[PDB]
Design a protein around this ligand. Structure first.
Ligand SMILES: *[C@@H]1O[C@H](CO)[C@@H](O[C@@H]2O[C@H](CO)[C@@H](O)[C@H](O)[C@H]2NC(C)=O)[C@H](O)[C@H]1NC(C)=O
Ligand SMILES: *[C@@H]1O[C@H](CO)[C@@H](O[C@@H]2O[C@H](CO)[C@@H](O)[C@H](O)[C@H]2NC(C)=O)[C@H](O)[C@H]1NC(C)=O
Lengths: 49, 82
């Protein structure tokens, strides 16, 4: 299983054409402020295949 | 060149070209669709304080194929540190 091929899953909004995002930060999936603590309603967008 | 940059991480783009510079120097910077456009013009100014009365066009100077979500900018000086 090659897990090096990962990609971003969650983001605040969409992308303008032809640009790249390298923000490796927790994404808040709900009303719980992650504040660098992860947990519920908080996910790491980068996941592999 | 050691102004402020101290933790320059791995990055993508570098470029070098000719230098630009009572000199009225006008520049236009635009960012459209991951493209950076720079127009420039240099004139000999003879007015005291503010912009003069007249008309002068600006020629295109450089284009860059780099996509950045630019929102702010600042000017760089070279003070007499001595
Ligand atoms: C080269 O760029 C990559 C792209 O971000 C860096 O990868 C991660 O960078 C963050 C810092 O924002 C680190 O916390 C991670 O540990 C890095 N992931 C790794 C190393 O697998 C990478 O750090 C950059 N290279 C260097 C030497 O900084
Ligand atoms: C470029 O960066 C700015 C940084 O503020 C982004 O502006 C924020 O975008 C988020 C996206 O949901 C909004 O929730 C904030 O309210 C915005 N803040 C401000 C001050 O505008 C902007 O979206 C970025 N451009 C992109 C991602 O294309």
């Amino acid at each position: 299983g090659n897990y090096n091929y990962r990609y971003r899953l969650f983001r605040k909004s969409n992308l303008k054409p032809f640009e790249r995002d390298i923000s490796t930060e927790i994404y808040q999936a709900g009303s719980k402020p992650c504040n660098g603590v992860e947990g519920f309603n908080c996910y790491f967008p980068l996941q592999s295949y | 060149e050691s102004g402020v940059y101290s933790s320059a991480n791995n990055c993508t783009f570098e470029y070098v070209s000719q230098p630009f510079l009572k000199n009225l120097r006008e520049f236009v910077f635009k960012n459209i669709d991951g493209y950076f456009k720079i127009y420039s013009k240099h004139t000999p100014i003879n007015l005291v304080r503010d912009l003069p009365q007249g008309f002068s066009a600006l020629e295109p100077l450089v284009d860059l194929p780099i996509g950045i979500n630019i929102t702010r900018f600042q000017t760089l000086l070279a003070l007499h540190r001595s």
